[PDB]
Amino acid sequence: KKHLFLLGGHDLAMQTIVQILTDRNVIFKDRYLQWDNALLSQYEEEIQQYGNKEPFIIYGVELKEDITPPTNYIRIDHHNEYATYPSALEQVASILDHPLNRYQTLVAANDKAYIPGMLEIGASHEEINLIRQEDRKAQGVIEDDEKLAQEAITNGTEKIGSLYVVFTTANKFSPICDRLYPYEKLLIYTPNELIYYGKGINSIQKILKRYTPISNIFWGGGINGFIGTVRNRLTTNEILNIVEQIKLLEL
Ligand SMILES: C[S@+](CC[C@H](N)C(=O)O)C[C@H]1O[C@@H](n2cnc3c(N)ncnc32)[C@H](O)[C@@H]1OP(=O)(O)OC[C@H]1O[C@@H](n2cnc3c(N)ncnc32)[C@H](O)[C@@H]1O
Ligand SMILES: [Mn+2]
């Protein structure tokens, strides 16, 4: 069986996947996608060419199946119903019998379980900082993202019980998490988007499903990971109601 890898949205783990695939002479396609455009249809041409074509197995790495996969397609993912699975990076390495070196295992732990993940395999303070900086960079965060993050923390943050609630107009949320960490619970929202981080995502999922179909929701990172809504799918009043419901859990 011959492998073809189709890559989803970029971050440090996806960049590490590119390196391993490049080193191992694997057939792969990388359209420089991001978290909010990682659609299988970005690779429609490749699906037409290799789909249902006997020798090949097509591995889709964190791609939304907006078109019907062919019979030789395998989804590689660790979100939603697969939120307990290892990072896509670890799954790809296993497919290729690739032993992850130390840096790569830190990348994988950060990708699946953030700073807590890196701490439980003994990452140092310098290692954690390099990984976070390189992850934000691979996501495309820039200076104006980091500036808006500081603004939201100074002027748009309030703490209710153990829950931080941050209103922001920032495009990228990861700079906010990295500035507020450590925290137990964090809710970041905009007029048309929210992401919740930390303890008890399952009760957050119960709230979200009263307002929107599951196709507008994503989660991962484990029991106390993250759960969010796809940008511009919910109205401001729906977001505001959800925010109130999440605050009520602190009572
Ligand atoms: C938590 S991140 C924040 C995205 C947010 N849009 C932003 O602006 O920064 C978003 C995750 O949701 C996924 N996602 C799915 N669909 C969409 C969509 N339509 N729009 C946006 N995001 C979508 C996306 O792939 C990513 O998962 P990943 O697994 O690829 O990456 C996880 C990232 O979060 C970090 N992370 C992992 N666990 C945690 C945690 N518990 N707390 C904070 N960060 C974590 C990890 O280091 C890595 O950088
Ligand atoms: Mn990813």
Longest CA–CA separation in the chain, Å = 58
Answer yes or no: is the C-beta of 135 below 6 A from any ligand 1 atom: yes
Answer yes or no: is the C-beta of 173 below 6 A from any ligand 1 atom: yes
Closest C-alpha residue for ligand 1 atom 13: 35
Contact (CB, 8 A) for 22 and 66: no
174: three-class secondary structure by DSSP: helix
Closest ligand (CA of 141)? 1
* CATH architecture under which domain 143-248 falls: Roll (3.10)
Answer yes or no: is the C-beta of 195 below 6 A from any ligand 1 atom: yes
Answer yes or no: is the C-beta of 177 below 6 A from any ligand 1 atom: yes
Atom of ligand 1 nearest to the CA of 198: 41
Closest C-alpha residue for ligand 1 atom 46: 111
Q: Where are the alpha helices (DSSP H) in the chain?
A: 12-23, 44-50, 88-95, 102-119, 125-139, 143-155, 174-180, 201-209, 236-248
Answer yes or no: is the C-beta of 42 below 6 A from any ligand 1 atom: no
- Identify the CA nearest to 250 among candidates 211, 208, 180, 203: 203
236 CB burial (10 A radius; 0-12, 13-18, 19+): exposed
Distance 173 CA to ligand 1 centre (A): 9
Contact (CB, 8 A) for 64 and 10: no
The pairing of beta strand 193-198 with beta strand 185-190: antiparallel
- Identify the CA nearest to 162 among candidates 220, 222, 246: 246
Cα distance between residue 195 and residue 246, in whole Å: 11
57 bridge partner residues: 3
Resolution in A: 1.9
DSSP annotation of 171 reads: S
Technique behind the model: X-ray
What angle is formed at CA 23 by the lines to CA 19 and CA 27, rounded to 5 degrees?
A: 90
In the chain, domain spans: 2-136, 143-248
Helices (H) and strands (E) in the chain, counts: 9, 10
Cα distance between residue 114 and residue 186, in whole Å: 14
Atom of ligand 1 nearest to the CA of 193: 6
Closest C-alpha residue for ligand 1 atom 34: 111
Distance set, CA 41 to CA 18, 38, 66, 107, 129 (Å): 20, 9, 6, 28, 35
Distance set, CA 210 to CA 58, 203, 214, 228, 238 (Å): 36, 11, 10, 14, 10
